[PDB]
Amino acid sequence: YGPKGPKGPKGKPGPDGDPGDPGDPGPKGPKG
């Protein structure tokens, strides 16, 4: 038996994450 070969190249980077959660609501408009 012989020794195992060299460890392989690291994998490619993963795909992009999703867009973030929606922001909070705007404030109430100014009173008249």
Partner: protein, 32 residues
């Protein structure tokens, strides 16, 4: 020769996603 080497490490986590959507419109203002 020997057995195949170990698999490479997993790739890097993918990039962070983009900023989330803008929040909803705020409620309209009170009558004066």
């Amino acid at each position: 020769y020997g057995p195949d080497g170990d698999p490479g490490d997993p790739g890097d986590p993918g990039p962070d996603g983009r900023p989330g959507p803008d929040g909803p419109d705020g409620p309209d203002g009170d009558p004066g």
